[PDB]
Amino acid sequence: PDETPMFDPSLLKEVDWSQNTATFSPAISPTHPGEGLVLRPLCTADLNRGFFKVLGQLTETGVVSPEQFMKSFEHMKKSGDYYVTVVEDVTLGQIVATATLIIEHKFIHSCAKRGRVEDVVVSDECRGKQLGKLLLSTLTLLSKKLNCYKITLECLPQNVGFYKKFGYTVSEENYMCRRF
Amino acid sequence: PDETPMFDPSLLKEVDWSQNTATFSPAISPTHPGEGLVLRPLCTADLNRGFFKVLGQLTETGVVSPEQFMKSFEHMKKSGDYYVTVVEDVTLGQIVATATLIIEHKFIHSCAKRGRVEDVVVSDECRGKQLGKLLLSTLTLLSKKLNCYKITLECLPQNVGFYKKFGYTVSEENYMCRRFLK
């Protein structure tokens, strides 16, 4: 594991924060996430900073080997299409929040790009401290900057009001699943 | 534009068709999609086989240069994660149906893979020929074969009964969208 980021950290900096609509108090931003905190791409050393401990609060992570993580990480990085983003408490050296933006390429809408928000979770001790809003507003604006024609996500009905804060609305389409 | 497929066509013969749950009458399969038809990966030469005319029946699919199409194709090919699959009517040399399987990589569920079914459309003159069922069944089984832990898709409630035929069920989760075009 090293400090190589999954994607160019500047992409987070250069998001047009003027387009944010979510309310912050105090007014944190991608460049100013809160003292002692950094908002950045996942890097391979994050395996040892409790990345999986955070993800484990959302759903099951099973047993993951360093080699398994490295291979997944390298594939994601190589694609250019995966924006796994974390908030790290630098004083503790621990990940405290994560969210992923995935870019999908299509042929419809003039060879469009489409965004998906995945795997959004704030560590329990850090909930209600604006990090979910920060992650969501930053990644949503990043997809618009990357020329996505739309961005989508799925959530339980109890979380709908949260995502509304970044301009998401409930689609008429149903989400259908088959589990193997 | 050439005949090179987006993915290994062998993968379509390796789908365990005995696991298909949808009812077909007449019996057709990935191997035998019907007389005059071939189910196969997209290739760049499909640009000139009416590929976009089919997509245009799904949603807006406007102006695209040959180089833009080839760039998207190569990018999709290079990832190994895109399975844009077509049915061609060989007598006419025209695409008559398309569906895409995308493989998404995760860190959850022990660094799992999950499938997405996207951009499913049969040309209206070929509907009721079981080509939509063929594509859905094949891609669903292919995702299983590729060790996805699940596969998902979104559709208007008006299409729910179609996807039920392949073992999909309506999830409790809401689908949410921010449209940057309107």
Ligand SMILES: CC(C)(COP(=O)(O)OP(=O)(O)OC[C@H]1O[C@@H](n2cnc3c(N)ncnc32)[C@H](O)[C@@H]1OP(=O)(O)O)[C@H](O)C(=O)NCCC(=O)NCCS
């Ligand atoms: C808790 C969670 C949903 C929100 O993140 P958070 O950091 O705790 O929330 P924030 O402090 O960033 O934002 C708080 C704001 O969102 C609102 N909010 C929080 N949860 C909400 C919900 N479920 N529905 C509607 N609004 C919600 C609060 O009222 C507050 O509103 P306001 O500050 O605008 O007045 C977070 O994303 C999380 O990890 N939760 C548990 C795992 C999870 O459910 N992940 C999402 C999978 S879809």
Ligand SMILES: CC(C)(COP(=O)(O)OP(=O)(O)OC[C@H]1O[C@@H](n2cnc3c(N)ncnc32)[C@H](O)[C@@H]1OP(=O)(O)O)[C@H](O)C(=O)NCCC(=O)NCCS
């Ligand atoms: C029309 C479409 C959805 C299905 O393809 P098709 O050629 O009509 O269907 P097939 O001949 O392969 O399968 C026919 C079966 O599916 C059923 N079916 C077709 N459309 C259906 C729908 N919208 N809802 C429920 N069932 C449907 C038929 O009743 C028939 O049932 P049966 O097998 O018991 O006889 C097709 O994929 C299409 O291009 N439609 C318009 C574009 C579109 O909406 N794409 C899907 C977006 S989520």
Ligand SMILES: CC(=O)N[C@@H]1[C@@H](O)[C@H](O)[C@@H](COP(=O)(O)O)O[C@@H]1O
């Ligand atoms: C299974 C399936 O085919 N689902 C499609 C989706 O894949 C496609 O991208 C979208 C286009 O509609 P849009 O132009 O409004 O984004 O329609 C449906 O939701």
